[PDB]
Amino acid sequence: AVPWTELLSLQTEDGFWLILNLNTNGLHSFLKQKGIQSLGVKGRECLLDLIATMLVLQFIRTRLEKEGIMKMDIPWAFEAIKQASEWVRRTEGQYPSICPRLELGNDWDSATKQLLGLQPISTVSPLHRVLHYSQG
Amino acid sequence: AVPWTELLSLQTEDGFWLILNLNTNGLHSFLKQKGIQSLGVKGRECLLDLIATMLVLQFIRTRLEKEGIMKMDIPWAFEAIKQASEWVRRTEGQYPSICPRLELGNDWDSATKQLLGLQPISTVSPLHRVLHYSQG
Amino acid sequence: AVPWTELLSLQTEDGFWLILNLNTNGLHSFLKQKGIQSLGVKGRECLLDLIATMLVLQFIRTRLEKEGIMKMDIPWAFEAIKQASEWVRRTEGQYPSICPRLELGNDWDSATKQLLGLQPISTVSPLHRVLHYSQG
Amino acid sequence: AVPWTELLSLQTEDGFWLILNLNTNGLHSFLKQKGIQSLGVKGRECLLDLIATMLVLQFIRTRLEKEGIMKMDIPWAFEAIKQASEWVRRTEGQYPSICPRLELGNDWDSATKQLLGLQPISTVSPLHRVLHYSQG
Amino acid sequence: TYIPRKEVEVVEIIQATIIRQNQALRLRARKECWDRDGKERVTGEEWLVTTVGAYLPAVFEEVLDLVDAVILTEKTALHLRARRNFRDFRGVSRRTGEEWLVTVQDTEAHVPDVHEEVLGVVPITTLGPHNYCVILDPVGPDGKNQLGQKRVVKGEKSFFLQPGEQLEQGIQDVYVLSEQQGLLLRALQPLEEGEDEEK
Amino acid sequence: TYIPRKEVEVVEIIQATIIRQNQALRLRARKECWDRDGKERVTGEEWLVTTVGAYLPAVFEEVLDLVDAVILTEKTALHLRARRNFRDFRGVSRRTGEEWLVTVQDTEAHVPDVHEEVLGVVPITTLGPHNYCVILDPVGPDGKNQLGQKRVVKGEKSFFLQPGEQLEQGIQDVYVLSEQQGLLLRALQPLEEGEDEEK
Numbered sequence: 001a002v003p004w005t006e007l008l009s010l011q012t013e014d015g016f017w018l019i020l021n022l023n024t025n026g027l028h029s030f031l032k033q034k035g036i037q038s039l040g041v042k043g044r045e046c047l048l049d050l051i052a053t054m055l056v057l058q059f060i061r062t063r064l065e066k067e068g069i070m071k072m073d074i075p076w077a078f079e080a081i082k083q084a085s086e087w088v089r090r091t092e093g094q095y096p097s098i099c100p101r102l103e104l105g106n107d108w109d110s111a112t113k114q115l116l117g118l119q120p121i122s123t124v125s126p127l128h129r130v131l132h133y134s135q136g
Numbered sequence: 137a138v139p140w141t142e143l144l145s146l147q148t149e150d151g152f153w154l155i156l157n158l159n160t161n162g163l164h165s166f167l168k169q170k171g172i173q174s175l176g177v178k179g180r181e182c183l184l185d186l187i188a189t190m191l192v193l194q195f196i197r198t199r200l201e202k203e204g205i206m207k208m209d210i211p212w213a214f215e216a217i218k219q220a221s222e223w224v225r226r227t228e229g230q231y232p233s234i235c236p237r238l239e240l241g242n243d244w245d246s247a248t249k250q251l252l253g254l255q256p257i258s259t260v261s262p263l264h265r266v267l268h269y270s271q272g
Numbered sequence: 273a274v275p276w277t278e279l280l281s282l283q284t285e286d287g288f289w290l291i292l293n294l295n296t297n298g299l300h301s302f303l304k305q306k307g308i309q310s311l312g313v314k315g316r317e318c319l320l321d322l323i324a325t326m327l328v329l330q331f332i333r334t335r336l337e338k339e340g341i342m343k344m345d346i347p348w349a350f351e352a353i354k355q356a357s358e359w360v361r362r363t364e365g366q367y368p369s370i371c372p373r374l375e376l377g378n379d380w381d382s383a384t385k386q387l388l389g390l391q392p393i394s395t396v397s398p399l400h401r402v403l404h405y406s407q408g
Numbered sequence: 409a410v411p412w413t414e415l416l417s418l419q420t421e422d423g424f425w426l427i428l429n430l431n432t433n434g435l436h437s438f439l440k441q442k443g444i445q446s447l448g449v450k451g452r453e454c455l456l457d458l459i460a461t462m463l464v465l466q467f468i469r470t471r472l473e474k475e476g477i478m479k480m481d482i483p484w485a486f487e488a489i490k491q492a493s494e495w496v497r498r499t500e501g502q503y504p505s506i507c508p509r510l511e512l513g514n515d516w517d518s519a520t521k522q523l524l525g526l527q528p529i530s531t532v533s534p535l536h537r538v539l540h541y542s543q544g
Numbered sequence: 545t546y547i548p549r550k551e552v553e554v555v556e557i558i559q560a561t562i563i564r565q566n567q568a569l570r571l572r573a574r575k576e577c578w579d580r581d582g583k584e585r586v587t588g589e590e591w592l593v594t595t596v597g598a599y600l601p602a603v604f605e606e607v608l609d610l611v612d613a614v615i616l617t618e619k620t621a622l623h624l625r626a627r628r629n630f631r632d633f634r635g636v637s638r639r640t641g642e643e644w645l646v647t648v649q650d651t652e653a654h655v656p657d658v659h660e661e662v663l664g665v666v667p668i669t670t671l672g673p674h675n676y677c678v679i680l681d682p683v684g685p686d687g688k689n690q691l692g693q694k695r696v697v698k699g700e701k702s703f704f705l706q707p708g709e710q711l712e713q714g715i716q717d718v719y720v721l722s723e724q725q726g727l728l729l730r731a732l733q734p735l736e737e738g739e740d741e742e743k
Numbered sequence: 744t745y746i747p748r749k750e751v752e753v754v755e756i757i758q759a760t761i762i763r764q765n766q767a768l769r770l771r772a773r774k775e776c777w778d779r780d781g782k783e784r785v786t787g788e789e790w791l792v793t794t795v796g797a798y799l800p801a802v803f804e805e806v807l808d809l810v811d812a813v814i815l816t817e818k819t820a821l822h823l824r825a826r827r828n829f830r831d832f833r834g835v836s837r838r839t840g841e842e843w844l845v846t847v848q849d850t851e852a853h854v855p856d857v858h859e860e861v862l863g864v865v866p867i868t869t870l871g872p873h874n875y876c877v878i879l880d881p882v883g884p885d886g887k888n889q890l891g892q893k894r895v896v897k898g899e900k901s902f903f904l905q906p907g908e909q910l911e912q913g914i915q916d917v918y919v920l921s922e923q924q925g926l927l928l929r930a931l932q933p934l935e936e937g938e939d940e941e942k
Contacts, residue, residue, distance in 0.1 A: 010341055013350070020340045028337065029391045035756035037379040038800055042808045043760065044381055045343035052340060065164065068156045068188060069146050070609070071181035078149070094809075096588045096606060096761060097574045106556060107173040107606070109180055119165045171557035174601055178609045179561065230610075232562060282477050285486070292476045300473065301527045309515040316517055317479035324476060342808070368787045368805065369773045378755060379805070576796065586796030588761040628764045629851075639851040640765065641814040688817060691869040691901045732873060732919060 002063070007056075008077065015083040017053040022117070023134035030130050034102045047098065050091055053084060058112035103127070138199070143192075144213065151219040153189040158253070159270035166266050170238045183234065186227055189220060194248035239263070274335070279328075280349065287355040289325040294389070295406035302402050306374045319370065322363055325356060330384035375399070410471070415464075416485065423491040425461040430525070431542035438538050442510045455506065458499055461492060466520035511535070560600040566613040568592045568655045574604040590658045613655035614665070621704045622646040622654055623663040630659040643707035663707075670702035671715060678712040679705075759799040765812040767791045767854045773803040789857045812854035813864070820903045821845040821853055822862040829858040842906035862906075869901035870914060877911040878904075 003019055010017065031051075036044050057072060060081075070092075073085040092108075103126055105111030114121050121127045139155055146153065167187075172180050193208060196217075206228075209221040228244075239262055241247030250257050257263045275291055282289065303323075308316050329344060332353075342364075345357040364380075375398055377383030386393050393399045411427055418425065439459075444452050465480060468489075478500075481493040500516075511534055513519030522529050529535045548554075563569055570592055573585040580602070585591065592611065593599060601607050614622055623645055626638040634650060638659075645666060646654050656662050671677060676698035681689045689708040697703070698718065705711070719727060736743055747753075762768055769791055772784040779801070784790065791810065792798060800806050813821055822844055825837040833849060837858075844865065845853050855861050870876060875897035880888045888907040896902070897917065904910070918926060935942055 010339060012341055017341050018339060024338045024340075025334070025390050028334075028385065032382065032385065032391065035758055037381050037755070038757035038806065039760060040806045040808055041342040041380055043806070048337070049341075049343075052337070056340065062161070062164075065184070065188070066160045067146060067154060068160075068192060069148055069153050069185075070177040071185075093572070093588065093590075093763070094761060096572055101758060108177055109173050110168065113164065113168065118161045119168065171559055173556070174558035174607065175561060176607045176609055179607070229564070230562060237559060282475060284477055289477050290475060296473045296476075297470070297526050300470075300521065304518065304521065304527070309517050313478040313516055320473070321477075321479075324473070328476065365771075365787065365789075368771055587759075588763055588796070641816050641851055690899075691818070691867065692871040692874070692899055730921070 008080065011080050015087045016049045017056045020056065020059060023130060026130055026133040031102060046091065047095060053088055054108050054112045055115060057084065058116050062116065062118055144216065147216050151223045152185045153192045156192065156195060159266060162266055162269040167238060182227065183231060186231065189224055190244050190248045191251060193220065194252050198252065198254055280352065283352050287359045288321045289328045292328065292331060295402060298402055298405040303374060318363065319367060325360055326380050326384045327387060329356065330388050334388065334390055416488065419488050423495045424457045425464045428464065428467060431538060434538055434541040439510060454499065455503060458503065461496055462516050462520045463523060465492065466524050470524065470526055558601060560598045561607060563596055563599050565596055566653055568594045568611045569599060570608040570611050570658060571601065571605045572608060574606055577604045592658060611655055613653045615653050616648045616651065618648055619668045621666045623666050623707060625661040625663055627659050627661060632657065645704055645706060666704050668702050668704055671697065671700060673700050674717055675715050676718050677715055680710040680712050681708050683709060757800060759797045760806060762795055762798050764795055765852055767793045767810045768798060769807040769810050769857060770800065770804045771807060773805055776803045791857060810854055812852045814852050815847045815850065817847055818867045820865045822865050822906060824860040824862055826858050826860060831856065844903055844905060865903050867901050867903055870896065870899060872899050873916055874914050875917050876914055879909040879911050880907050882908060
């Protein structure tokens, strides 16, 4: 029973994206260590907004699959999901293979699900200091 | 006596699909380990919606067979069952033999019934970490 | 729950920038030791205003990323963020590579995030007497 | 929370400058020992007014930087700051390099900040008997 | 079956895709490479593959989505904007931003290329024997619209409104007059009309 | 893979940028250097790179932002102010502050240079056969406006309002007169008009 109207409050004015329950500062440190400053400030913010939007989409999709149910397009949030899908399916093409090269996963399912923390990650991957640094 | 009106609440706006009582996160981990990211994000969501819709259909068919009674087409849900059958009999042809290649079963009866958990599965199959991981 | 209306009170009359929680006097001593007087008094104040504006932008962006959400352009501060972005994207071009040469970071993300104090800094860098001098 | 209206009371009738919290008599003794009588009485008073005006400007700028925010040009003192900047940017050109030759600092930032007492001064400099003579 | 090795690490178990008739598959590159047809592809560059059957992606080819063709009946045509400089299936050169129509006399089915854009499916405008219409901004012999001008089409004729063209008020019916009926109608420009032998 | 070394320190792990079709990348220098094309660049100097694919920044090239080109349809043109003395893509010399228009007869797509400025996209002014217009401050043969003067344009004509020009009241319709109608109209300067053979 996550706060849904407070998720509707966090819809941005362009159509992208503590309730998410994720270590954000350690995630910023991880993405800085992987070298995200080589894309410009505009490219860095455009990639962080894509990663945050896909993380919120994977969170809501895990919530909907636990209930049972680029194809996200309930009546109370159909417009936000629609404009989010229309944003993501335009902005993803600028960054191909940005999930392996930032070392988050193979594709967006793998990357957002291993960052979401609902699946275990193997020991040879460097993804251990993003889900276990918040447990202190 | 499953909640039926709450099943009517979970009908999607296109015609596809905790009440289902199945480990969804372990199922996502199993389908990720079997390599479902090689179909695109659109193909992955189109396959997950097919698997979830057929799982709900096998659940309701086991419920109706315990009472005694691609051919699913009670007055309170005839429209949802009809549009679900019209969705499934169109979307199944894109994915032939997707149940052996994802290692769920021979056909959709075998796959959805062994994932539903109402029949025992042999020991040589890798389907043990989807019905026994939720028992912890 | 930082004071937001008091942040609106500190908007300057041109469009640039204790609530920020940063050692300002030690920061002035650090930037004086790095030799900022060789730019004129006008150039020194123009660089301090840029550094303070980008520090406030990184603070607010860390606040918004913890909630989940040169591209900064909520209804209560859209005008201030807009005029701040229009100021920064004009005044940054006069000072290229001013973050390595003042020894704050590679780019503005690295510099403002290591000065913000939300990420650890390596021991070979001289950035230790700006975050640990205020802990006395 | 310095007295601000009492700072507005001390605005001179031409536009230049115990609340400042500085040893003024020791500062006069220091500037007399550095030989300020060789400029005429008019030149001596014109230089003392410049030094006092820049000291008040550095005090107010340290106050504004602790809040977070020749370029000084709040609504309650914009006219006084404006006429002070218009006075200083005219009267500074008569005295180039008057801060090293009176031994106060390299430029006006260094001189007024080391006289303001918010930064430590090295031991080889003769600026020790202006900040430590008032501590008796 | 696969026998393992110490210095070789299995990354993932990829799955093929099934392409039926009248479909194609959109898949970008991940790296400077060569595709199955033998053509160099840069990073991020998308293209299409039109083989029917099971299609197995390569290691550098991110499969995006399936593209299904558009069936062209005699009463519908396809409005397409070009996205860059290319050559389409008929073999004519296109320019960026250019629009055109595709009809049944080109193909009975058309799969939308990644260098194109589906703007909409244009239904045919047909005129009866008792109908006429006026076309705002018609296309001349140069393939470009005459902006501001008009063109009157009368008779039994079925055509498509080309990109830019428009009807002024719709399909209009012709004036038909007995001997008890007449029309008063004013000129706007010096004109000639030889209905009979005299002018 | 990289084998380390004692006297060599890895600073950061930089990432390339993907430039699709009809885009370019803006990136300033950090130091006196030479770019990939082989041209000397001073500190702070920005420029553009127009290669398609993955583009890897150099050690002295701060990538700023991606610049996407502007598609020139027949009803739109591009108003551009120069920012310094340069030569654009057609090869004409520009001066600082100068304004001009770019149409489809130059290019079908234009990527805005760093020495230029997008002032706006000018829609075409088209006149019907029943329309005329008056142009405030028209451009003469010297490329400069005649300030204060006017110019009357009549007929079927489609044109762009060049930088400086303006319509006096808009697209105006021509007076059309029967024999029951007349116009009273006064001169303002000594004038001649040979409508018929006499003057």
